[PDB]
Design a protein around this ligand. Structure first.
Ligand code: 9IE
Ligand code: 9IE
Lengths: 131, 131
């Protein structure tokens, strides 16, 4: 079944949020309605500002600023690892975090900078299990 | 717990898609980064084009059209009921469909026009149960 009676006595669709996210990622792959390019060192990543703000405390602060909300290019701190950013941008659009021994430190540092706390907490838990 | 091992051996976050949708609806309530106004008769509804395209075959067609993708105002067919549109716009941003005996016919006609098939199918199932 695709729906259920929610706690508030309203009909709720089980797969709706994941289907919207799937379609937003499809728009990203096809470069449709993307309104910003995130520059990390020499790498560029096209995205939708609303998705970035919905997933990151840093992007939420930047795109609510009256002056920065209109910028089409956003440059991140040059210390940010582009692969770590790519993994997190993929996570924002998919709910899947490709965490590996070789990338976990850069993904954790990038999530700290981007203010994605649950991702930071998860990284710490996986690091603690290795020690 | 907030995560699990997905079928593809990747870490997946259970609440991520619903949390992104919750934040997109918060942006809509605060009128932040909304880039279109949908006009239905005398009523106006501000929204994010990406969310509309992700939820409707009609909006997906309109906003992928090279000429219409740039429009800041979109006028719907004057026969469309504004309450039916409002209920569906709320559903797009929340996963909850406020279906009632008094609105089900207008919600079904609006979902047919907007090309939201599962909503149409659900409306038909609820109508069939009343007859
Ligand atoms: C889905 C989740 C994934 C990553 O974890 C986090 C967020 C996360 C998101 C926001 N963004 C809003 C927070 C509150 N209200 C609004 Cl309208 C918006 C937006 N847009 C701010 C701060 C956030 N923080 C600290 C996170 O740790 N997003
Ligand atoms: C979440 C769900 C809610 C309502 O049910 C429907 C959609 C629905 C969505 C689209 N939109 C895309 C369909 C395929 N690919 C992309 Cl990139 C995009 C976008 N954006 C097209 C057609 C759609 N149809 C016929 C529906 O019945 N959305």
């Amino acid at each position: 079944n695709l729906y259920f009676q929610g706690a508030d006595s309203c009909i709720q669709f089980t797969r709706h949020a994941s289907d919207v996210l799937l379609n937003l990622n499809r728009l990203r792959s096809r470069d449709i309605l993307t309104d910003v390019v995130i520059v990390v060192s020499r790498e560029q990543f096209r995205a939708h500002k609303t998705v970035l703000m919905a997933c990151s405390g840093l992007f939420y602060s930047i795109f609510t600023d009256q002056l920065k909300c209109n910028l089409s290019v956003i440059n991140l701190d040059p210390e940010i690892n582009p692969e770590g950013f790519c993994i997190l941008l993929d996570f924002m659009y998919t709910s899947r975090l490709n965490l590996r021994e070789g990338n976990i430190m850069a993904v954790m540092a990038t999530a700290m900078y981007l203010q994605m706390e649950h991702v930071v907490d998860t990284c710490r838990k996986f690091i603690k299990a290795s020690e």
